[PDB]
Amino acid sequence: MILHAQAKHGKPGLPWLVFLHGFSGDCHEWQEVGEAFADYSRLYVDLPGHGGSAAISVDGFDDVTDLLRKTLVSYNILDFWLVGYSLGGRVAMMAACQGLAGLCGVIVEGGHPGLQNAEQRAERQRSDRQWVQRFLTEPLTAVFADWYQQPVFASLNDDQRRELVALRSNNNGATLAAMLEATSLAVQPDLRANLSARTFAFYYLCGERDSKFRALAAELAADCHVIPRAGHNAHRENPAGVIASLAQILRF
Numbered sequence: 001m002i003l004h005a006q007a008k009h010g011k012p013g014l015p016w017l018v019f020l021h022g023f024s025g026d027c028h029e030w031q032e033v034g035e036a037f038a039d040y041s042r043l044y045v046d047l048p049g050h051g052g053s054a055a056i057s058v059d060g061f062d063d064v065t066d067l068l069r070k071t072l073v074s075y076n077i078l079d080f081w082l083v084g085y086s087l088g089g090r091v092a093m094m095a096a097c098q099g100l101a102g103l104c105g106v107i108v109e110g111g112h113p114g115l116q117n118a119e120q121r122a123e124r125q126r127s128d129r130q131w132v133q134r135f136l137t138e139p140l141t142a143v144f145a146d147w148y149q150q151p152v153f154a155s156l157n158d159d160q161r162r163e164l165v166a167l168r169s170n171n172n173g174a175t176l177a178a179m180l181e182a183t184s185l186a187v188q189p190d191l192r193a194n195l196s197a198r199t200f201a202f203y204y205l206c207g208e209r210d211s212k213f214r215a216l217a218a219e220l221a222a223d224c225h226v227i228p229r230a231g232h233n234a235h236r237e238n239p240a241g242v243i244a245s246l247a248q249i250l251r252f
């Protein structure tokens with residue numbers, strides 16, 4: 001079993017850019033940005049429970065990393081960057097720290113490096129449990145209308161929220177629920193120490209208006225690129241700014 005993905009081949013010999021979307025996203029998430037790097041090869045991955053990988057279930061990050069590994073081998077990818085947004089950024093950090101052969105760098109946009117005590121983990125476990133029940137029982141247009149009013153999305157305007165609700169409502173609530181639980185921040189290790197001691201290059205992207213993750217990026221031992229006039233999903237809101245930041249990272 002491998003993950004569903006869309007591959008675009010660039011110049012032979014150049015690295016792959018392997019893109020990981022966030023929760024409720026799919027492999028289209030990073031394509032507006034990624035296709036600007038037409039010289040590189042691009043792999044747009046559907047995470048378990050998402051897109052064409054809906055039917056792939058996982059118990060946790062170990063399974064996701066294994067599936068990522070197998071997917072890379074299947075596409076003959078030997079030299080690559082992992083680029084992840086939000087949940088995809090957490091998947092990228094977990095996989096990179098567990099070890100992925102051929103990984104040369106990780107770029108994370110708004111990915112949480114991990115909670116730091118039991119009370120925080122309990123709060124997140126309980127809140128994700130509540131979201132799981134909603135994804136199993138409610139119209140997705142209703143669930144996503146609330147999803148995009150969470151604090152991390154406070155910066156959005158109502159036109160942006162309406163568009164996102166319509167987009168994310170194309171999803172399987174049951175398989176989203178399963179993945180939400182399986183890779184919940186509540187079960188993720190605190191990766192700060194591991195990230196500090198990294199073999200691989202590590203870069204962080206954060207929207208200017210994303211107060212929570214601007215603070216977190218500062219805690220990390222990483223070059224952080226703040227994307228102007230953008231919230232948490234900075235590549236969606238300011239794709240040209242993110243393309244510029246990626247170009248600075250990759251080509252130097």
Ligand SMILES: O=C(O)CCC(=O)C1=CC=C[C@@H](O)[C@@H]1C(=O)O
Nearest residue numbers: 022023024085086087088090233
């Ligand atoms: O863009 C989105 O709707 C969701 C982004 C995303 O992956 C996350 C948003 C907020 C909490 C988590 O579930 C998750 C994350 O782990 O970053």
